[model samples]
Target: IQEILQRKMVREFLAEFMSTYVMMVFGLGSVAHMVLNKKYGSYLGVNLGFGFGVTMGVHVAGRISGAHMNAAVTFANCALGRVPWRKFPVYVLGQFLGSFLAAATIYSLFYTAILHFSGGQLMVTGPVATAGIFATYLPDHMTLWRGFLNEAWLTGMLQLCLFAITDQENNPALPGTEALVIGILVVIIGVSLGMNTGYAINPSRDLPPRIFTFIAGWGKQVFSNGENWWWVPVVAPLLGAYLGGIIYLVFIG
Candidate 1:
């Protein structure tokens, strides 16, 4: 029991670190690329970058842990009864801590490059880092209510996809499609909804990085200012997951 616990403890932490680190590096790196290039501002390249990062992360880590790089996904899984509630904290904590550390690492590697490229803004998001970084860019234009709605609806759809693909109970007795299906949907999210607020689409995906954004001094604009996009990602993704889970549960189970 003791040996198993020791191994499990160490393994979970390492997995969290490795998984989120890889994702944060590749995903944000891609964003940085998009932020730089004016010609390819379509964000398709960044989307592919995001998709591939997810695919690679899952391929490497999915076997052991289902590749839950996002907290929204973890929460959704628990909602669907797929993940036991008891183990939820382990997954969530690991994921967020991993993401922060990963972003911290990315910050270190690209610090000088980012600093020079950004041209003197400690506060860089999709907006400030407009030179070519993939970031969740929200408008200074939209009313907080409008922005919140967008965040919620988009995340809901994202969670819907999660339920459709995973959650064997949703498609009981079957694993559903391969990573290709997921990759295709990821591209769709990026293309269709990528416009509004960078469409984080998943709470787990959005929150940790948003926290990083605040920590990295991207500015008080994202965190404060009564916009509450922070909760938009959290509530929307989970509600979307709940709706999706119920919808799929009817079909498969």
Candidate 2:
């Protein structure tokens, strides 16, 4: 068992899984707290929660897996040849599973509060809807194309900054401070771009929880909401990350 655990692929897979698990638990926990109990948290609290969650995940998996907790980031890196294509599936699998389990854990922890808040209806939209606690949702006023552009733009900025921060040729962050800097970046994105589609910025961060809500109780509406908006978060972030990576390579890196 020790030998098996010591294998490179195994270690990377486990690191990615645990790192993403750590991230989503804190992120989703904060959202659940705020949504279920108004007095317990605020929008800033949610932002800080997710930011710190990313920080903690980087601390856990940075050395082993490059801490690509976000599938979009992994996809970008793979496309850029930073990570092998064979590892893409491994990274994505671990991220999705970790995110799914985190949603489950948060749901169980906030079960009664959620029940009370939504009257046990498990709605996808409307005043009492709790699905937003687990996944991204566009505001009623936002158009589908606008939301798509928002997600892509936000994620593009994220990838660009992240590449610059970690690049040795550029004015990179100080060695130990990379995680903190990344966390602050996430917080900034959340505060600035989050109003639209909640700034998912990461497919791994959004899709698995959405899937969990579908299986847990929210039903098909999870997919149907916002004119079948579930695909935007997944597809847009990947494209955005690629665009950001290419831009960084061409102009900065």
Candidate 3:
């Protein structure tokens, strides 16, 4: 029984929690600060917002958790046999929990800063939006499905590119100097596709926060409110990224 549960259910959750905690703090922290204070949350502005946190996630959690740090990346890696199928449920669960905890913590720590606007009375309820869209106004106009496909395609590209760079077969050695390559790809994708629903190319990265958004009571508006667009970001990116991995096998082979 003890062996079956994997050491007191210990190994996975703790790592996932800390990993997700740090990412949300830095990633969304950048977005909130850059957008409000720096006056540069524009396309070029938030690119690093996504980049630094992701890179840090990779660095900090990489050795222990394979630094999956996000759901979509785990899904993509599973197909490649880098992540085990049996552990899938635990990992996904941990990933979401981590983000939820991280957002809650950030909201708590930064409550004062967030309340500064709105005459210092508005509580703002939760942390800033962590999507690549950041403050882009697309959610008001685009259908949830449209936004979903948009993110799906972008995430596919990101997974495809990142997988290729870190591939053992293709590069055949560690991606020693390719760190910036990965970071640059994220920056590039954010700049190029960011306008359309905030290019959250990693499905897990995009959706888990959306999950936290609802749990943290971000708003009924987040549920696609009237648009029913929530399904797209969840379903499309997984399928698209799966295709990305398969299609990549053809080219990498």
Q: Which stretches of candidate 3 lie over 4 Å from their true place?
A: 1-9, 38-43, 119-137, 172-175, 211-218
TM-score per candidate: 0.80, 0.97, 0.79
On lDDT, who's better, 2 or 3? 2
Candidate 3: the clashing residue pairs are: 72-204, 132-198, 133-198, 144-229, 155-201
Whose lDDT is greatest here? 2
Give the number of the best model, judged by TM-score: 2
Which ten-residue region of model 1 has the weakest summed lDDT? 126-135
Q: How big is the positional error of residue 161 in model 2, measured in Å on the Cα after superposition?
A: 0.3
Please state every model's RMSD to the true fold in angstroms: 3.7, 1.0, 4.3
Query: Where is the poorest 10-residue window by lDDT in model 2?
Result: 32-41
lDDT of 1 by residue, 1-253 (tens): 6676577655765576577667767777777656554665447777887777776666666756677777767777787788778767777788777667666666666677667766777654445553224235456676666766777677667766766676554452235345666666777888888676677765556667667767566666666534555566567666665666676567654
**Ranking according to lDDT, highest score first:** 2, 1, 3
The models' CA-based lDDT, in order, is 0.66, 0.91, 0.64
lDDT: which is higher, 1 or 2? 2
Error of 2 at 225 (Å): 1.3
